[PDB]
């Protein structure tokens, strides 16, 4: 029902003025909510990992991908809900965070692009959809055009996206140059014995992966993720992660990969140490985004990992999502604002956040504890079940470099809290306006999920056991 | 039935609004102001709370009570740090001593008893 939304709504936006831009996004917010609520029951379409191949050996719908298919709608409700609702009713928050005319169109185009990867059996549908989401992120970076860093980052993202376009296409071309298929029934543990399809599927993997921030190709996504405005990055550091990683975990095309393991080690190492000497918050946050995809590279190596993947996805797409919205709240209390597109940069600027409220701080504190695996949190059991999959198949040195990465990570995650609870010398006593209710209520929801998410630890394991097998 | 006073508590803040700060109230090293204030300090001791009465009421009454008791706590202890204040008698027991000598210590003694006889 994405296309059924899009074809109506672009007619609707074209027939609309410029002041309706909040209300269209409010409509799409409620729309995606009702898509999830009124049609949730399609998990009943299987009972024993019963997998459908739809549109004739082209799409693949299954037990697994239905989850990510729900997840992207769930996060898009939040992202849309940022736009459509004011933060405050101020002059500042209407010359900041005012969406463009075409923006909400480009999101559902991107969600079409993201879903047509995870549901794709064919390499051709893969290629069309990665071009689709690449063009999506090209525009969504370049749409806030009157910022020099925005256009510079759009070009920067563009050329590496073009290299990975041609590299994935060359991998598909080479796989076709040795085989007359494009699907993945042609692997089936028999050609792997007798044909060197290692290097070709490895080169497929690398080309798919280097749109993430995989550490040979390291600095450029980080330069994007700071040169973007503070709003767009909370969308574009999430969707290209969980789209293609759900593809790559769905089809384990590189098992016992010598290449992916070494790159996973180097990913965790340079992300953890790259988070260290940095005072720009978008940097720090993007390196967190790197190391968590570092864990994703570990989950790429295994065989039959649909638990630890999906659980760490719904971990990450809540916690990583929510810490942005916390520092989106935090820019009201700061004392210096530059850069209309990108108000906070320096982590120094939220120096006295606890003498503003205790509760945004506590909510920030538990989610930054959620990145480091603090055991009563939902963020913990992700790393726990990763390691229950790691030593399941003997990635021993990978496990100990995971521990090194977790400690060196948790050093810089606490740097936020080192800043956040200190003296400020100029404390708030009375603000006139409040924060718009249900916008903040979403953050309350997303944080009670993280704190009280070990409640449904048992029931998600039962749903895992019945449905996914 | 410890039901506290309403209108007196309304009138208490009317006195409080005219009062000088606690950081002033005893910086004068007589009783032109001392005689009223060290009997205002008895209103911290006067014990009108309402055991059941606090349950049955509203947040404005609670906030008004809280500001009252805060300033009464101030003027109770500040002139105690200077000098009712001009007295010297240790008969005021303390705050914590209710639920520790009557709960904590006898339960600890009971714990000692049970550890002896269970042996």
């Amino acid at each position: 029902m994405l296309i059924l939304a899009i074809i109506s709504l672009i007619t609707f936006v074209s027939m609309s003025k410029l002041s309706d831009n909040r209300a269209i996004i409010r409509l799409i917010n409620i729309y995606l909510i009702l898509v999830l609520v009124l049609d949730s029951f399609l998990y009943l379409l299987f009972l024993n990992n019963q997998t459908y191949t739809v549109m004739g050996e082209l799409l693949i719908f299954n037990s697994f991908t239905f989850y990510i298919d729900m997840l992207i709608y769930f996060i898009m409700i939040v992202i849309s809900s940022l736009y459509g609702y004011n933060l405050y009713n101020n002059n500042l928050y209407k010359t900041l965070f005012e969406p463009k005319k075409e923006l909400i169109i480009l999101f559902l185009i991107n969600i079409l692009g993201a879903l047509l990867i995870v549901h794709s059996n064919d390499f051709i549908t893969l290629f069309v959809a990665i071009e689709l989401q690449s063009y999506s992120i090209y525009l969504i970076t370049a749409i806030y055009n009157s910022s020099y860093k925005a256009s510079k980052a759009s070009m920067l993202y563009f050329f590496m996206g073009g290299i990975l376009s041609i590299l994935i296409a060359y991998s598909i071309n080479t796989y076709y140059s040795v085989l007359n298929s494009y699907t993945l029934h042609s692997l089936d543990s028999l050609i792997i014995n007798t044909l060197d399809l290692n290097l070709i599927l490895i080169a497929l993997s690398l080309g798919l992966l280097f749109k993430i921030g995989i550490a040979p190709l390291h600095k450029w996504l980080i330069s994007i993720y700071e040169n973007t405005p503070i709003l767009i990055t909370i969308y574009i550091s999430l969707i290209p992660k969980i789209s293609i990683l759900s593809y790559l975990v769905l089809s384990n095309i590189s098992i016992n990969s010598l290449v992916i393991s070494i790159l996973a080690i180097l990913t965790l190492l340079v992300g953890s140490v790259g988070g260290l000497l940095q005072i720009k918050i978008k940097r720090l946050l993007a390196f967190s985004g790197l190391t968590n995809a570092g864990y994703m590279m570990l989950l790429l190596l295994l065989n039959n990992n649909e638990f630890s993947y999906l659980y760490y996805i719904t971990q990450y797409s809540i916690s990583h999502l929510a810490i942005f919205m916390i520092i989106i709240f935090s820019i009201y209390y700061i004392n210096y604002i530059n850069n209309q597109y990108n108000p906070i940069i320096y982590v120094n600027q939220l120096k006295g956040l606890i003498h503003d409220n205790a509760y945004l701080v506590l909510s920030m504190a538990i989610v930054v504890f959620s990145f480091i695996g603090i055991p009563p949190l939902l963020g913990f059991f992700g790393k726990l079940n990763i390691l229950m999959s790691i030593l399941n198949n003997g990635y021993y040195f990978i496990s100990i470099v995971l521990i090194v990465a977790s400690l060196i990570s948790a050093l810089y995650y606490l740097y936020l809290l080192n800043v956040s609870i200190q003296d400020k010398n100029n404390i708030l006593i009375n603000s006139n306006e409040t924060v718009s209710s249900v916008l903040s209520y979403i953050l309350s929801s997303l944080i009670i999920l993280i704190t009280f998410g070990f409640i449904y630890n048992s029931l998600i394991i039962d749903i895992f056991n019945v449905y996914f097998n | 039935l410890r039901a506290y006073n309403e209108e007196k508590e309304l009138a208490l803040k009317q006195r409080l609004s005219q009062l000088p700060p606690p950081g002033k109230a005893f910086v004068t090293a007589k009783e032109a102001e001392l005689a009223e204030l060290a009997e205002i300090a008895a209103l911290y001791k006067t014990d009108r709370v309402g055991i059941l009465d606090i349950l049955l009421l509203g947040n404005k009454h609670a906030r008004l009570y809280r500001d009252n008791t805060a300033l009464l706590k101030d003027y109770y202890y500040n002139g105690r740090r200077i000098l009712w204040e001009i007295k010297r008698e240790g008969a005021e027991k303390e705050d914590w001593v209710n639920q520790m000598y009557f709960l904590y210590a006898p339960s600890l003694i009971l714990l000692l008893i049970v550890m002896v006889y269970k042996s």
Binding site: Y332, N339, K424, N426, I427, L428, I429, S431, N432 | -
Partner: protein, 90 residues
């Protein structure tokens, strides 16, 4: 142009509470002594004396105890003996 909203009315923080009178006349020499002490590691370096200490207690002393413990592992059995019985197991 971009300054935060006027509806803050922020006030200065207090520590909260009472100026206790200073019951201590601090010695600047004693204070800089202890502040020199508690951050010793920020100026620590390697010398010959450092190397002597870390030769002994980091390597040599545990190797001495390792020569004691593994060589004398389960030898002695001092439970109840007799005049003439062996004391060890080896």
């Amino acid at each position: 142009e971009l300054k935060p909203s006027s509806a803050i009315q922020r006030g200065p923080l207090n520590k909260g509470g009472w100026d206790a009178p200073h019951a201590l006349h601090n010695d600047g020499a004693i204070d800089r002594y202890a502040h020199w002490r508690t951050f010793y590691q920020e100026r620590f370096k390697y010398t010959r004396a450092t190397g002597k200490s870390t030769l002994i207690f980091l390597v040599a002393f545990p190797a001495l105890i390792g020569y004691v413990a593994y060589q004398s592992e389960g030898l002695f059995e001092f439970a109840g003996k007799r005049r003439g019985e062996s004391v060890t197991t080896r």
